[PDB]
Amino acid sequence: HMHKDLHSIIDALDTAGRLIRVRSQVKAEHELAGIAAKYEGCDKAVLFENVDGNDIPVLMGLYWSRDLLGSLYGVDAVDMPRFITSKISHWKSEPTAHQLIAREHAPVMAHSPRVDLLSLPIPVHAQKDGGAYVDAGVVIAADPDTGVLNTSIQRFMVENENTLHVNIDAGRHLGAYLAKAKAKPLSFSLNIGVHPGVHFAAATPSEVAPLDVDELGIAAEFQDGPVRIVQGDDPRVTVLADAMISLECQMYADDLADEGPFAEVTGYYAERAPRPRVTVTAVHLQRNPVFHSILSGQEVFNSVGLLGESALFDQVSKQVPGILEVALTDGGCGFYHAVVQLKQVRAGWSKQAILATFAAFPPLKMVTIVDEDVDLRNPRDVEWAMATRLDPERGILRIDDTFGHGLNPSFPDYFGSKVGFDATRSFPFEEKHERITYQDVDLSRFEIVEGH
Amino acid sequence: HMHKDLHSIIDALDTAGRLIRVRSQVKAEHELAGIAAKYEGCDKAVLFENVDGNDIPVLMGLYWSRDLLGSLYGVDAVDMPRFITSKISHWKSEPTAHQLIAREHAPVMAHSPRVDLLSLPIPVHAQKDGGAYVDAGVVIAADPDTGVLNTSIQRFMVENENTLHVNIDAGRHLGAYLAKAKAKPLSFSLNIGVHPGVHFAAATPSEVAPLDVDELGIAAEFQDGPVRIVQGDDPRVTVLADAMISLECQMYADDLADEGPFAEVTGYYAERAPRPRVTVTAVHLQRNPVFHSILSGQEVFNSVGLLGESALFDQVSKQVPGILEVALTDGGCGFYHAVVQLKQVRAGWSKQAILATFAAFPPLKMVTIVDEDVDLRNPRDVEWAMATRLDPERGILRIDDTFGHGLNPSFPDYFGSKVGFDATRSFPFEEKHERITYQDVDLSRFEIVEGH
Ligand SMILES: Cc1cc2c3c(c1C)C(C)(C)CC=[N+]3c1c([nH]c(=O)[nH]c1=O)N2C[C@H](O)[C@H](O)[C@H](O)COP(=O)(O)O
Ligand SMILES: Cc1cc2c3c(c1C)C(C)(C)CC=[N+]3c1c([nH]c(=O)[nH]c1=O)N2C[C@H](O)[C@H](O)[C@H](O)COP(=O)(O)O
Ligand SMILES: [Mn+2]
Ligand SMILES: [Mn+2]
Ligand code: NA
Ligand code: NA
């Protein structure tokens, strides 16, 4: 249950019968994403064997099911956030130095075609996206002053066969490395089709891996041995050796061009706007490369939840007794709604749980508290807790004029109202709140034919 | 797409591949319900071929999927509430008189064993239920003064081989017929394994079918020809001829015995308490009888929602422009949460929608309003509307000290607080609230191998 590269992942999923093979030709323009969309969240990913008759298949849906990600590393869905956090803790405490290797030993350096981005089966995802996007690509970039690596993930729109337009949010580390090159232009690699270890490194936030620190070793914790890197053709760039595809790239500051629209976590479109142009100097491919894309939605909600929930639980359970679990629900775009599950020990702690949760995760708009006997990850079950337990008069806590996330239109200019719901039963515990219960049953204990 | 009896239903489901056959022996005590519970809500019912080696199999889960009920009558899940209401309208306007038939022509009169309730595979459902229950049984009872029929559905607990304890809520028509016999004791039949038409007749509320009116003709609207009835052995009683099983029963007023606990719609237990004892005078069975039981949960939520939603929609759309649909959600126990979907035409109507909905359905605790582009029946999607569109400051409307449903512990003594959520986008419509969209795609148009 360790994985060197995406090949390992796909074979494991294929073997486990958690792969959906779409054998028919599909169009990279809208149709592919459309099919993905009908499967979003089920316990399998999707391999498109034939995209516009490309030799290169595309994989989508790797991140939309915690059960699937768990199966790849042998952990239950419920234990995955702790699993990942424990591994990031081990990296912080004893980092594994990368292994630099010779160009002709690096599987990704197998081929170097003349740069034609339109030869790649890059999907146009949502119906109003401003073009085809690579959105699963991990950017590795060296500090122009100190050579220290930074690993981030960023959406790149294809303009033409050799140009991308990239979105760099405010306070991103890639942003800061560009500021340094603009005191001299910034080279980097875009590594498409990486294993989850690289994905989690890329998505690890600033306060876990500061600017002056190399988060890529996080990936080493999810594979035997160290992360393999390789000198590019640049040579200011460093390439991920075990990537399916890797793009050597260069970008000048103060050189903007229209990119977007694209889907945001909110489920709304980004504004099309002038954002940095990046020019693709070279292309490297394994033999039998699969192109990896992410469908905006649960794939992103789970990326954020798996990395963020353990810290949040840690912060709330430290301030409040009897906390059991915290969910950054998919309904809330893995960012705007937290459900906190606790075992009450005294009246009043449920409200402290609301304060602690809102204080620990500034983007949150809603917090719901529920008891140990409610499934915090089932929105039906939280609705039920609201319907039978919430006191609308005393259990709704509203915070006005507070800081929040500006992408969410409930928070114009990073400013608005938050609300907590205390959907707990009354304490001390009373019979009138004791839930009915059906015997728990192993279905393998019986012969069951379900439809034919 | 018409059905004379339960046999018709089961064959149609079997043919349609919407039947789950559990072939292994299962225990009527807890185990059976436990298996049902793992399937609750999916697009199939469950036939248990072998319950404690009884010759009689049991059917469960007929009502937990509107898609399944729709498939039986050729209507989409979305059109089923209107379908049922239209048919009850036709019955109110032009009722079909019943067909009385000779004892030896009535399939249910095939056999009349010595009365042994413990020979029947009657499930003990929830782990703290006070015994085995028949809960899908339709009671037919004649007015002791006027002979006019009343059809209701009531939970009966088995005490011993010839005695049941029944729960009769306040203001039930069976209650009123008992008050009349107690001016002279009340006979009636308990008809188990009936088609949905009989179920909907039984569940049709007081204000649609008054005390002095015979609701059983409603069933005639869901079958070719009239409802077949037959003289019992009593002979103050009337039996449903096409039932799988029918129990001739007698009950004296002021003759109480401990019954319960049992699951209520809330998902909590009823208080065990002195409630009327009923004594089973005779038992009738088809050959090839199947015993029909209901799992407390979605089976009950859909019974209430399918009968109630059209009236509620009718009442709200009359007072407010742009109403499209109203859901009595399963999270709210088909009773405590209504989601109202509308197409906004002017600021302010969303709040009138909250007032109209609360006014039209007194049990409601929560109302949520959403726009045309949110799936009101998907709790994830309503959570999303809450996360991105609700203004917590101006969009939460709280009503205190109002009437509500006493079974819900948020409303002690039929008194408490209600709350409406206005999770609509801003009007006039703005780009920042336009949801991303993936192309709609027919999956039958492609070769897809899904796991193996
Ligand atoms: C998980 C994830 C994170 C995205 C992201 C996506 C995903 C799935 C996409 C691909 C679906 C859409 C695009 N994303 C962008 C993004 N940050 C950014 O500046 N621009 C982006 O366009 N991020 C966030 C960024 O990669 C993380 O916050 C890193 O932790 C930042 O790295 P750093 O701390 O080294 O700066
Ligand atoms: C759908 C449904 C309705 C139940 C019901 C259930 C279901 C599934 C069960 C079986 C799961 C639990 C028990 N139920 C009872 C009940 N009414 C009552 O007085 N006592 C009950 O125990 N009802 C409702 C009752 O039958 C309806 O209110 C009828 O409209 C009454 O007919 P009436 O208007 O002629 O009185
Ligand atoms: Mn960093
Ligand atoms: Mn009636
Ligand atoms: Na990072
Ligand atoms: Na009735």
Side-chain angles (χ1 to χ4, degrees), chain A residues 11 16 23 122 125 157 165 226-227 258 263-264 286 300 302 325 338 361 445:
Chain A
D11 288 356
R23 297 170 68 69
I122 303 185
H125 294 91
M157 190 186 104
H165 307 156
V227 177
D258 277 341
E264 279 170 341
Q286 294 192 359
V300 182
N302 286 336
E325 194 174 350
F361 209 80
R445 281 184 63 237

PDB file of all heavy atoms in Angstrom, chain A residues 11 16 23 122 125 157 165 226-227 258 263-264 286 300 302 325 338 361 445:
ATOM      1  N   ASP A  11      -3.288   0.663 -11.770  1.00  0.00           N
ATOM      2  CA  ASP A  11      -3.250  -0.824 -11.762  1.00  0.00           C
ATOM      3  C   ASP A  11      -3.991  -1.322 -10.523  1.00  0.00           C
ATOM      4  O   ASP A  11      -4.781  -2.285 -10.655  1.00  0.00           O
ATOM      5  CB  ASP A  11      -1.822  -1.378 -11.809  1.00  0.00           C
ATOM      6  CG  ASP A  11      -1.138  -1.206 -13.158  1.00  0.00           C
ATOM      7  OD1 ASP A  11      -1.797  -0.717 -14.104  1.00  0.00           O
ATOM      8  OD2 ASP A  11       0.050  -1.558 -13.252  1.00  0.00           O
ATOM      9  N   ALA A  16      -8.659  -3.699  -8.238  1.00  0.00           N
ATOM     10  CA  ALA A  16      -9.682  -3.597  -7.170  1.00  0.00           C
ATOM     11  C   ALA A  16     -11.080  -3.399  -7.781  1.00  0.00           C
ATOM     12  O   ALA A  16     -12.059  -3.480  -7.016  1.00  0.00           O
ATOM     13  CB  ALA A  16      -9.314  -2.496  -6.211  1.00  0.00           C
ATOM     14  N   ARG A  23     -14.748   3.202 -23.204  1.00  0.00           N
ATOM     15  CA  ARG A  23     -14.041   2.581 -24.356  1.00  0.00           C
ATOM     16  C   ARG A  23     -14.384   3.360 -25.627  1.00  0.00           C
ATOM     17  O   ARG A  23     -13.462   3.515 -26.474  1.00  0.00           O
ATOM     18  CB  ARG A  23     -14.408   1.098 -24.438  1.00  0.00           C
ATOM     19  CG  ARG A  23     -13.966   0.318 -23.205  1.00  0.00           C
ATOM     20  CD  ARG A  23     -14.461  -1.110 -23.046  1.00  0.00           C
ATOM     21  NE  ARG A  23     -13.896  -2.024 -24.049  1.00  0.00           N
ATOM     22  CZ  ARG A  23     -12.620  -2.407 -24.100  1.00  0.00           C
ATOM     23  NH1 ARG A  23     -11.740  -1.991 -23.191  1.00  0.00           N
ATOM     24  NH2 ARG A  23     -12.253  -3.209 -25.083  1.00  0.00           N
ATOM     25  N   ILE A 122      -6.464  17.518 -23.595  1.00  0.00           N
ATOM     26  CA  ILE A 122      -6.730  18.417 -22.437  1.00  0.00           C
ATOM     27  C   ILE A 122      -8.202  18.781 -22.475  1.00  0.00           C
ATOM     28  O   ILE A 122      -8.629  19.402 -23.433  1.00  0.00           O
ATOM     29  CB  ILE A 122      -5.838  19.664 -22.481  1.00  0.00           C
ATOM     30  CG1 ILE A 122      -4.354  19.287 -22.528  1.00  0.00           C
ATOM     31  CG2 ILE A 122      -6.166  20.556 -21.290  1.00  0.00           C
ATOM     32  CD1 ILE A 122      -3.399  20.462 -22.463  1.00  0.00           C
ATOM     33  N   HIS A 125     -13.861  21.682 -19.639  1.00  0.00           N
ATOM     34  CA  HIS A 125     -14.623  20.987 -18.564  1.00  0.00           C
ATOM     35  C   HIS A 125     -16.069  21.526 -18.502  1.00  0.00           C
ATOM     36  O   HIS A 125     -17.007  20.894 -19.086  1.00  0.00           O
ATOM     37  CB  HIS A 125     -13.865  21.103 -17.236  1.00  0.00           C
ATOM     38  CG  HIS A 125     -12.554  20.398 -17.166  1.00  0.00           C
ATOM     39  ND1 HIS A 125     -11.356  21.020 -17.514  1.00  0.00           N
ATOM     40  CD2 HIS A 125     -12.234  19.161 -16.711  1.00  0.00           C
ATOM     41  CE1 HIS A 125     -10.364  20.171 -17.290  1.00  0.00           C
ATOM     42  NE2 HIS A 125     -10.874  19.020 -16.801  1.00  0.00           N
ATOM     43  N   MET A 157      -4.828  27.614 -18.326  1.00  0.00           N
ATOM     44  CA  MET A 157      -5.684  27.595 -19.540  1.00  0.00           C
ATOM     45  C   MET A 157      -4.753  27.534 -20.744  1.00  0.00           C
ATOM     46  O   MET A 157      -3.773  28.302 -20.719  1.00  0.00           O
ATOM     47  CB  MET A 157      -6.522  28.881 -19.626  1.00  0.00           C
ATOM     48  CG  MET A 157      -7.615  28.864 -20.690  1.00  0.00           C
ATOM     49  SD  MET A 157      -8.436  30.465 -20.831  1.00  0.00           S
ATOM     50  CE  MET A 157      -7.708  31.120 -22.341  1.00  0.00           C
ATOM     51  N   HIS A 165      -2.199  30.429 -19.967  1.00  0.00           N
ATOM     52  CA  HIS A 165      -2.452  31.528 -18.996  1.00  0.00           C
ATOM     53  C   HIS A 165      -2.775  30.876 -17.642  1.00  0.00           C
ATOM     54  O   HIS A 165      -3.623  29.945 -17.566  1.00  0.00           O
ATOM     55  CB  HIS A 165      -3.543  32.482 -19.499  1.00  0.00           C
ATOM     56  CG  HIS A 165      -3.344  33.060 -20.863  1.00  0.00           C
ATOM     57  ND1 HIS A 165      -4.422  33.514 -21.630  1.00  0.00           N
ATOM     58  CD2 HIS A 165      -2.238  33.271 -21.610  1.00  0.00           C
ATOM     59  CE1 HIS A 165      -3.977  33.986 -22.785  1.00  0.00           C
ATOM     60  NE2 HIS A 165      -2.637  33.841 -22.801  1.00  0.00           N
ATOM     61  N   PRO A 226      12.828   8.016  -1.567  1.00  0.00           N
ATOM     62  CA  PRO A 226      12.706   9.458  -1.715  1.00  0.00           C
ATOM     63  C   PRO A 226      12.041   9.837  -3.040  1.00  0.00           C
ATOM     64  O   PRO A 226      12.033   9.031  -3.942  1.00  0.00           O
ATOM     65  CB  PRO A 226      14.180   9.910  -1.691  1.00  0.00           C
ATOM     66  CG  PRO A 226      14.929   8.772  -2.357  1.00  0.00           C
ATOM     67  CD  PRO A 226      14.135   7.526  -2.027  1.00  0.00           C
ATOM     68  N   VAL A 227      11.560  11.072  -3.107  1.00  0.00           N
ATOM     69  CA  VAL A 227      11.008  11.679  -4.342  1.00  0.00           C
ATOM     70  C   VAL A 227      12.138  11.807  -5.348  1.00  0.00           C
ATOM     71  O   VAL A 227      13.137  12.478  -5.033  1.00  0.00           O
ATOM     72  CB  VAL A 227      10.363  13.053  -4.095  1.00  0.00           C
ATOM     73  CG1 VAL A 227       9.879  13.690  -5.387  1.00  0.00           C
ATOM     74  CG2 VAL A 227       9.208  12.967  -3.116  1.00  0.00           C
ATOM     75  N   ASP A 258      -5.966  37.578 -21.023  1.00  0.00           N
ATOM     76  CA  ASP A 258      -7.305  37.132 -20.552  1.00  0.00           C
ATOM     77  C   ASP A 258      -7.276  35.614 -20.298  1.00  0.00           C
ATOM     78  O   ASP A 258      -6.959  34.867 -21.253  1.00  0.00           O
ATOM     79  CB  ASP A 258      -8.395  37.546 -21.552  1.00  0.00           C
ATOM     80  CG  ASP A 258      -8.923  38.978 -21.449  1.00  0.00           C
ATOM     81  OD1 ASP A 258      -8.739  39.642 -20.375  1.00  0.00           O
ATOM     82  OD2 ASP A 258      -9.545  39.415 -22.444  1.00  0.00           O
ATOM     83  N   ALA A 263     -14.390  27.069 -13.249  1.00  0.00           N
ATOM     84  CA  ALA A 263     -15.137  26.746 -12.009  1.00  0.00           C
ATOM     85  C   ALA A 263     -14.290  27.047 -10.759  1.00  0.00           C
ATOM     86  O   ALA A 263     -13.148  26.609 -10.699  1.00  0.00           O
ATOM     87  CB  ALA A 263     -15.562  25.303 -12.032  1.00  0.00           C
ATOM     88  N   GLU A 264     -14.860  27.765  -9.790  1.00  0.00           N
ATOM     89  CA  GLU A 264     -14.330  27.945  -8.412  1.00  0.00           C
ATOM     90  C   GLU A 264     -15.002  26.960  -7.433  1.00  0.00           C
ATOM     91  O   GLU A 264     -15.965  26.300  -7.829  1.00  0.00           O
ATOM     92  CB  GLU A 264     -14.484  29.422  -8.050  1.00  0.00           C
ATOM     93  CG  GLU A 264     -13.341  30.215  -8.654  1.00  0.00           C
ATOM     94  CD  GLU A 264     -13.397  31.728  -8.624  1.00  0.00           C
ATOM     95  OE1 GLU A 264     -14.505  32.292  -8.446  1.00  0.00           O
ATOM     96  OE2 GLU A 264     -12.309  32.348  -8.798  1.00  0.00           O
ATOM     97  N   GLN A 286       6.310   9.960 -20.292  1.00  0.00           N
ATOM     98  CA  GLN A 286       6.600   8.501 -20.177  1.00  0.00           C
ATOM     99  C   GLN A 286       6.117   7.830 -21.473  1.00  0.00           C
ATOM    100  O   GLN A 286       5.392   8.497 -22.267  1.00  0.00           O
ATOM    101  CB  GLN A 286       5.947   7.889 -18.929  1.00  0.00           C
ATOM    102  CG  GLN A 286       6.510   8.406 -17.600  1.00  0.00           C
ATOM    103  CD  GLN A 286       6.066   7.599 -16.392  1.00  0.00           C
ATOM    104  OE1 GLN A 286       5.314   6.639 -16.502  1.00  0.00           O
ATOM    105  NE2 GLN A 286       6.500   8.017 -15.205  1.00  0.00           N
ATOM    106  N   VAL A 300     -12.141  18.512  -5.486  1.00  0.00           N
ATOM    107  CA  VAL A 300     -11.468  19.658  -4.807  1.00  0.00           C
ATOM    108  C   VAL A 300     -11.916  19.696  -3.340  1.00  0.00           C
ATOM    109  O   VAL A 300     -11.034  19.871  -2.470  1.00  0.00           O
ATOM    110  CB  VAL A 300     -11.740  20.981  -5.552  1.00  0.00           C
ATOM    111  CG1 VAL A 300     -11.031  22.171  -4.930  1.00  0.00           C
ATOM    112  CG2 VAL A 300     -11.356  20.844  -7.008  1.00  0.00           C
ATOM    113  N   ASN A 302     -12.790  17.259  -1.275  1.00  0.00           N
ATOM    114  CA  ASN A 302     -11.985  16.250  -0.546  1.00  0.00           C
ATOM    115  C   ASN A 302     -10.509  16.669  -0.464  1.00  0.00           C
ATOM    116  O   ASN A 302      -9.916  16.373   0.578  1.00  0.00           O
ATOM    117  CB  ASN A 302     -12.111  14.863  -1.155  1.00  0.00           C
ATOM    118  CG  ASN A 302     -13.432  14.190  -0.868  1.00  0.00           C
ATOM    119  OD1 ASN A 302     -14.097  14.510   0.096  1.00  0.00           O
ATOM    120  ND2 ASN A 302     -13.793  13.200  -1.668  1.00  0.00           N
ATOM    121  N   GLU A 325     -15.401  14.249  15.950  1.00  0.00           N
ATOM    122  CA  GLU A 325     -15.073  14.389  14.518  1.00  0.00           C
ATOM    123  C   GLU A 325     -15.579  15.739  14.017  1.00  0.00           C
ATOM    124  O   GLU A 325     -16.504  16.282  14.598  1.00  0.00           O
ATOM    125  CB  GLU A 325     -15.700  13.228  13.745  1.00  0.00           C
ATOM    126  CG  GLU A 325     -15.185  13.034  12.316  1.00  0.00           C
ATOM    127  CD  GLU A 325     -15.714  11.792  11.598  1.00  0.00           C
ATOM    128  OE1 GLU A 325     -16.357  10.943  12.286  1.00  0.00           O
ATOM    129  OE2 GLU A 325     -15.500  11.672  10.337  1.00  0.00           O
ATOM    130  N   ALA A 338     -18.910  23.498   8.395  1.00  0.00           N
ATOM    131  CA  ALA A 338     -18.300  22.471   9.245  1.00  0.00           C
ATOM    132  C   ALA A 338     -19.389  21.910  10.151  1.00  0.00           C
ATOM    133  O   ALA A 338     -20.140  22.678  10.743  1.00  0.00           O
ATOM    134  CB  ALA A 338     -17.181  23.072  10.011  1.00  0.00           C
ATOM    135  N   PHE A 361     -11.194  28.414  11.574  1.00  0.00           N
ATOM    136  CA  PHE A 361     -11.280  28.261  10.081  1.00  0.00           C
ATOM    137  C   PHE A 361     -12.052  29.413   9.456  1.00  0.00           C
ATOM    138  O   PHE A 361     -13.276  29.354   9.253  1.00  0.00           O
ATOM    139  CB  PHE A 361     -11.868  26.903   9.690  1.00  0.00           C
ATOM    140  CG  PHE A 361     -11.421  26.320   8.369  1.00  0.00           C
ATOM    141  CD1 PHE A 361     -10.202  25.682   8.254  1.00  0.00           C
ATOM    142  CD2 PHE A 361     -12.241  26.362   7.257  1.00  0.00           C
ATOM    143  CE1 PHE A 361      -9.813  25.122   7.057  1.00  0.00           C
ATOM    144  CE2 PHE A 361     -11.850  25.783   6.064  1.00  0.00           C
ATOM    145  CZ  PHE A 361     -10.644  25.162   5.969  1.00  0.00           C
ATOM    146  N   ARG A 445     -23.183 -12.537   5.250  1.00  0.00           N
ATOM    147  CA  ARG A 445     -23.771 -13.644   6.064  1.00  0.00           C
ATOM    148  C   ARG A 445     -25.010 -14.252   5.383  1.00  0.00           C
ATOM    149  O   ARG A 445     -25.540 -15.217   5.937  1.00  0.00           O
ATOM    150  CB  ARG A 445     -24.141 -13.157   7.477  1.00  0.00           C
ATOM    151  CG  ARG A 445     -22.975 -13.047   8.449  1.00  0.00           C
ATOM    152  CD  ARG A 445     -23.396 -12.663   9.864  1.00  0.00           C
ATOM    153  NE  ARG A 445     -24.261 -13.690  10.428  1.00  0.00           N
ATOM    154  CZ  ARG A 445     -25.512 -13.530  10.902  1.00  0.00           C
ATOM    155  NH1 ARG A 445     -26.077 -12.335  10.964  1.00  0.00           N
ATOM    156  NH2 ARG A 445     -26.185 -14.581  11.359  1.00  0.00           N
TER     157      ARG A 445
END
